Design a protein around this nucleic acid. Sequence first.
RNA 1: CGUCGUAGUCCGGAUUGGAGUCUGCAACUCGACUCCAUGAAGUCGGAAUCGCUAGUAAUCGUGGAUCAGAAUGCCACGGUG
RNA 2: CUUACCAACCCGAUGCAAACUGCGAAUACCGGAGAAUGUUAUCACGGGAGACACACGGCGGGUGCUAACGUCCGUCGUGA
RNA 3: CUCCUAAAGAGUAACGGAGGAGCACGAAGGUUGGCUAAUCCUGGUCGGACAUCAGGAGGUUAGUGCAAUGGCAUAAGCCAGCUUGACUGCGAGCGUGACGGCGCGAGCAGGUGCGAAAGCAGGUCAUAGUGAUCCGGUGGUUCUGAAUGGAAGGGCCAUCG
RNA 4: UGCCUGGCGGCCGUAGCGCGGUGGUCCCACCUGACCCCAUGCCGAACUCAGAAGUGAAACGCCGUAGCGCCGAUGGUAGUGUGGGGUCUCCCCAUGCGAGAGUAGGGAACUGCCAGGCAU
RNA 5: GCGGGGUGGAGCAGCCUGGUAGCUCGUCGGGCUCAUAACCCGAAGGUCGUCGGUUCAAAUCCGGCCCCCGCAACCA
Lengths: 136, 51, 177, 117, 76
Amino acid sequence: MLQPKRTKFRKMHKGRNRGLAQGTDVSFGSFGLKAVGRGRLTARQIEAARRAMTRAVKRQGKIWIRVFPDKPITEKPLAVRMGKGKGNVEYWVALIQPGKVLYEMDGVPEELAREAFKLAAAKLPIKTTFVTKTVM
Amino acid sequence: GIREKIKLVSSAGTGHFYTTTKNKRTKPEKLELKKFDPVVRQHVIYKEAKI
Amino acid sequence: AKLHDYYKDEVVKKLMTEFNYNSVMQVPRVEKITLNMGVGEAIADKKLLDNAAADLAAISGQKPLITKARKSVAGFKIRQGYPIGCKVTLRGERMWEFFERLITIAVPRIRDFRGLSAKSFDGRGNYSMGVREQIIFPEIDYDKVDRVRGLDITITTTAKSDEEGRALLAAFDFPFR
Amino acid sequence: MDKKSARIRRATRARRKLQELGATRLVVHRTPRHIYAQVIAPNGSEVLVAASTVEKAIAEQLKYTGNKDAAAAVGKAVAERALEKGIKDVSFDRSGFQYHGRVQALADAAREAGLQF
Amino acid sequence: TRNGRDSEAKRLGVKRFGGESVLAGSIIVRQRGTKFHAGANVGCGRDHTLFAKADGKVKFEVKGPKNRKFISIEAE
RNA sequence: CGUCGUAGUCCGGAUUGGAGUCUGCAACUCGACUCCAUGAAGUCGGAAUCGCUAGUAAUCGUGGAUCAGAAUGCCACGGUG
RNA sequence: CUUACCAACCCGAUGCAAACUGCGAAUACCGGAGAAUGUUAUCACGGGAGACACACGGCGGGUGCUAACGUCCGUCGUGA
RNA sequence: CUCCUAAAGAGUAACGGAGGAGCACGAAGGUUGGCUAAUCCUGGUCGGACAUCAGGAGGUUAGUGCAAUGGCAUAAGCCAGCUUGACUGCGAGCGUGACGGCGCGAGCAGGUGCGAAAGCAGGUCAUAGUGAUCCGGUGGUUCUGAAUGGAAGGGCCAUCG
RNA sequence: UGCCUGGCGGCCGUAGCGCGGUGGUCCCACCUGACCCCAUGCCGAACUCAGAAGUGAAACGCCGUAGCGCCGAUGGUAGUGUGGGGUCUCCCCAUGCGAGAGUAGGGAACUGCCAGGCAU
RNA sequence: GCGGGGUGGAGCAGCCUGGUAGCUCGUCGGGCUCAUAACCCGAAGGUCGUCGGUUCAAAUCCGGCCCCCGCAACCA
């Protein structure tokens, strides 16, 4: 599970998730999984989708993970009233905007990359699409 | 909370005095300064005394 | 000013053609000789550092400059600002009258002499070497010796490379192993 | 580290203060061979009077053009050149040089010649 | 451990903006450092408060080789 | 008779380097001895413990057996005592 | 000596930040000038108060689960 | 007290997110003169990853009595000389508070320090280091003094709990 | 009037850095000497004084050069005031404002006062 | 939910007040004994639960994580 090794602060504001994404094109590999929806990606979802793609291509070629869950999310335990300070950090998320490229793959045929990305997309809470590297 | 309050009495006949602090552990020597005495309107020397 | 006079007349015109200099100002020079004595152990007692600097005062006839610790480091357990060692820099003819005093007296005295190294150059044309014994100088008498502390000697030259650097001291007949 | 740039750093503070005070300053520049003197307007861009040893009108009457008594000649000259021009009170700008020796000999000579500073 | 502390706001910032006419002694800007520097007819207090040393209109300029912001009084 | 004059020394001799001698078919493992050089620990020894009653203890040399060579061991002898 | 691996700095490429900024709006705010419009709508002093339990909606946020007809601020509107 | 939340003037809540203070200093204050870091590389007696020396790179990544922020090269950082302006009376004009208050302040008078001089100095780079009133203490005082002269007590000024 | 140098400014990177070249009559720099004025918490290095044998090596100035920095449109995009709308954690429409980054490109500063030298 | 604790093999100091690791037992070598215990002489073993920070310097001071024993969980 991806997680920052250390942070300047432990807890962060909720914030908002407006706007479109940066890094909207395949920059390392040849095929990419681009998010068309908006939402959060927990570190477990990222790891689950990575394993689904890693096993799909039988550990072949190269795989990049363009996102990183750097935002901590706190929760209050059960049977606890409101107040008495912010909750404890439970997991980390990466904010996703439409157009964000999540994963990139290289070294495999396209027809195999589509199935690998299709298996991984089933683990993610946001709608995605298949993209390929283009001549800028 | 170590600095004690002291007073500097004018060497002139007037009873005028200033007040200041002093760390009597590191500086056991008496403090002597030239300060303005508003009674005689001159700069005389002021010597230390107990508050 | 023996080698000083020997500098401006002999070693300039052999070097002027050795490197084919256009101006005489291109020939390297010798700015200063600075003698460092890192005591290090004076923190235990400082009575030994004054007489330690008393030796360095007799080697060059100049009152030494006591160096202080630039920063606190516990690896040698000293706090910043402690008197840690003395040094003397020599310029002008006092450098020269000392510069011959070792090359003609400081060379033929060191125990098991084998010659100086040609690799002990800074990389931009400045030489530095350390003598281990202080009883090698005529000034310091053997009778009066409380310790056998050495010292470092570095040669500051206007040379730009080590080749021009080694060429200059070679002109003064420096022992190069 | 050139000695010049290290000297402008020494002269920057006093020049800022004189500029803030709106005073007409007497700038002094000293070289190993010559000595110079200028009286600058309070705005710092107009030279009212000037005198130096590179002017042959003053250089011919000196044994050497860069010693202490040569500076006294420029100090005397720049003051009488400014008195008739109308300036009487100025501020001495040593301009990074120590107020000692030649620049000091230039100052008191101008002070002796009737320039109030 | 536990948060919940803060200090009273100090009401810093610019008090008289560009073009405003001020009397001598009027405070122009309160600041912690010298974010703004004193120009002509402007003093710098011990807490780096910039105050007008003469009547006139305040003027903001950026000058010098470090592009520092200066405040001066156009005496009128 | 001279010297050393209380010091790790003109005490102490370990260890090591170089050069050799002899025995022996053969001195590498693994001999004894010589010369030059070097000069460890050691400044009288904790708990404890041993021998000795008179030509004894202590100390000083000498010889023999075994043995080509290889004794600080063993067995014997006398000097001082 | 070459060797399951980890790897600083630097260089190239790619992201992230309420407590990052070599950039930087819209608005808002302060000041000046100018018309038109507004029953002085402004300020000062004096007489009399009431009120100091707010609610929801929009926008910007903290908090909570971007849960609550939740909670806590900013601002506007309506109810009061 | 400092930062964020705070929505680019000010201000702005929560048992919201992070840290500090209840001092220190007669020099760590004033002034004049001077000075410029961190880190790393190379070379060099003991000496080592790390001491002092020399050179280059580097350019403030350092430093600031202490938290954070804003500042700081003209340095507000570092060093030395001489010093007491860590002055007395005031104070145009502002800032900030419901108020009590708190803050900034050119200039004026008296006297003083440093500087050749222009000048600078009414504590410290700035923002925390604090406690109203009553009662009482101590010193001073061309104030008052219950018939009068004194005194007690009170007032005023300085200061303490 | 032109060239060149020095001083003081304006301006504050289109002005900086690098690379290459170049300059000594004057100027400047290094330089020479140092008992003395003065100076080194040691050192005439620096500061200071007395000088003019040497040199433009360094430094500084100048010239060239697009290696880097720097400047930088147009268009689009993001955001956003007001009004309206939706599938309302986010958007869309009308209208006004309109970046940042990046791209084309620009770019090896410009200028005032005074002084000296040289040509004129 | 609040208090105290973790350091040679075992049991405990030092921490408060930063620089310097103590005690008793045990273990190891040597003695006494015919032999063992007791006893006598000497010696070894901790880098302080961890990671992180403050400091020139951390067992010692401050944060977090692991653990260990405690106290509290009240009115319906």
